[PDB]
Short mmCIF file of C-alpha atoms in Angstrom, two decimals:
data_model
loop_
_atom_site.label_atom_id
_atom_site.label_comp_id
_atom_site.label_asym_id
_atom_site.label_seq_id
_atom_site.Cartn_x
_atom_site.Cartn_y
_atom_site.Cartn_z
CA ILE F 7 -5.11 -15.58 -17.36
CA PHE F 8 5.71 -15.55 -27.18
CA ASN F 9 7.65 -13.39 -24.65
CA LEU F 10 5.83 -11.77 -21.68
CA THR F 11 8.45 -9.90 -19.56
CA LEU F 12 5.65 -7.54 -18.36
CA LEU F 13 3.57 -10.49 -17.01
CA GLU F 14 4.45 -11.36 -13.36
CA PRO F 15 6.53 -14.62 -13.22
CA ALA F 16 4.79 -8.79 -6.11
CA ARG F 17 3.70 -6.27 -8.84
CA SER F 18 4.59 -6.52 -12.58
CA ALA F 19 7.99 -8.13 -13.35
CA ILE F 20 8.87 -5.07 -15.54
CA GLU F 21 7.59 -2.74 -12.76
CA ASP F 22 10.15 -4.32 -10.42
CA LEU F 23 12.89 -3.85 -12.99
CA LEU F 24 12.28 -0.12 -13.36
CA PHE F 25 11.67 0.57 -9.69
CA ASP F 26 14.87 -1.21 -8.71
CA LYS F 27 17.05 0.42 -11.41
CA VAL F 28 16.10 4.03 -10.44
CA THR F 29 17.32 5.06 -6.93
CA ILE F 30 14.47 4.89 -4.33
CA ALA F 31 14.40 5.44 -0.49
CA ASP F 32 11.05 7.23 -1.16
CA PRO F 33 8.78 4.92 1.03
CA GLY F 34 9.69 5.75 4.66
CA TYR F 35 6.32 4.51 6.03
CA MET F 36 5.36 2.62 9.27
CA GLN F 37 8.97 1.48 10.00
CA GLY F 38 10.54 4.29 7.94
CA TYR F 39 10.97 6.54 11.00
CA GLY I 4 -3.97 1.41 14.14
CA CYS I 5 -0.73 0.16 12.51
CA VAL I 6 -1.92 0.37 8.85
CA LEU I 7 0.23 3.55 8.55
CA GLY I 8 0.76 4.16 12.27
CA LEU I 9 -1.15 3.78 15.48
CA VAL I 10 -4.42 5.64 15.04
CA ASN I 11 -6.73 6.70 17.83
CA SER I 12 -9.80 4.89 16.58
CA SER I 13 -11.20 1.57 17.78
CA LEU I 14 -12.19 -0.43 14.69
CA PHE I 15 -9.99 -2.73 12.56
CA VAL I 16 -11.44 -3.88 9.18
CA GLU I 17 -15.04 -2.96 8.17
CA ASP I 18 -15.48 -4.05 4.50
CA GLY I 19 -12.95 7.36 0.75
CA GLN I 20 -11.29 10.15 2.79
CA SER I 21 -7.88 8.44 2.19
CA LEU I 22 -6.81 8.84 5.87
CA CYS I 23 -3.73 6.64 5.19
CA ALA I 24 -4.26 5.43 1.58
CA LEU I 25 -6.86 2.75 0.67
CA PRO I 26 -8.50 3.07 4.20
CA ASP I 27 -11.90 4.70 3.44
CA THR I 28 -12.51 5.67 7.12
CA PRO I 29 -16.35 6.09 6.80
CA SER I 30 -17.95 7.34 10.07
CA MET I 31 -13.98 6.05 13.84
CA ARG I 32 -14.55 2.85 11.88
CA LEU I 33 -11.48 3.08 9.68
CA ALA I 34 -9.47 0.76 7.38
CA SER I 35 -12.01 -0.14 4.63
#
């Protein structure tokens, strides 16, 4: 441990933005089947 | 096993060959 959107308020806060925006369905693991 | 799916070994956490991902699996004896 100004504006820090990248800093987490799981994963980076900006990471969650981008991953949510773009279409996913990529991780079919463990319960994916 | 249930880290990625049931695995036919007999050891839980012992803290790589990347058997699932982070699991090192140094030998059996997986999930490190």
